């Protein structure tokens, strides 16, 4: 499998570690290497891929795991389908979208989610999963202008029958100006399922503002900008998003062109939903995309 792909061209690189695309089998591939650093991540995602078998058309097409040893240490791999669009946050800055596409993605971004958080039940049914890192540049833009979320490793999963929390053990933490209030001031209940729910609906109304902005309405778009970027740095600090977030209980701005656009309205309230303070105010992924199944 590892010993089996071709790497062609190094795609990322950054604190997790390499994406590579290579050939298997004559067909493209996405090759993550992690570093020795966020080797739990690792094991995370293959649980969640391998043992819980994580599948669905709006989450990351999982191919294998695997580990080679060269250079007197081992290396961690994740391969998994190829998306020559890359991920929503480099598509939104290459194109505008029309109502169709819009929808398209928030709606498929949606569907993912909901498969996350909502359990399976049968005698090998899917665990409740919540994400913990859902954010633009962990979504990947497919050809037929769905997408799908990547990296599990954040993962955390509960079952109702057993009423067990799996927040698993890993030191990585969440991209920061994604994190819901209740992170950034720490009063999130860390040992409820639901909270880590919460959270998800929190960075899914930030995605939801990202793309909207995209949108054309009356020949009007926004230029792609990330969530808070008018009053935060780049690579915020914990104390940067908390100010924003907690002290000045600060949202993404609405557009008032949005309100000149049916669809585009109804998205602004969606993601206002989401952004609650009070975490238990905030749509369910579910409610979301119901609501985004009913709009055109
Ligand atoms: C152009 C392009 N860039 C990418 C960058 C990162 C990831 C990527 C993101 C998150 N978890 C992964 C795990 C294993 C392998 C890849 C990933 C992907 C899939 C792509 C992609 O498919 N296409």
Known sequence: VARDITLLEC???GRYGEVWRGSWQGENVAVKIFSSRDEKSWFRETELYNTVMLRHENILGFIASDMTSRHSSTQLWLITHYHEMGSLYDYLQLTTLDTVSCLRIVLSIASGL???????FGTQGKPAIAHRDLKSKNILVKKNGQCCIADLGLAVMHSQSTNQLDVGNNPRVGTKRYMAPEVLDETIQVDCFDSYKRVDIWAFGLVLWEVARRMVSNGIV???????????????????????????????????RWFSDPTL???????????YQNPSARLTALRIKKTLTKID
């Open 114 to 120: 909901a498969h996350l958080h909502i359990e399976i």
């Open 222 to 256: 926004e230029d792609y900008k990330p969530p808070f970027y008018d009053v935060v740095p780049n690579d915020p600090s914990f104390e940067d998003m908390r100010k924003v977030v907690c002290v000045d209980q600060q949202r993404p701005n609405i557009p008032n």
């Open 265 to 275: 309205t109804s998205l602004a309230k969606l993601m206002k939903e989401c952004w």
């Open 11 to 13: 795609v990322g690189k």
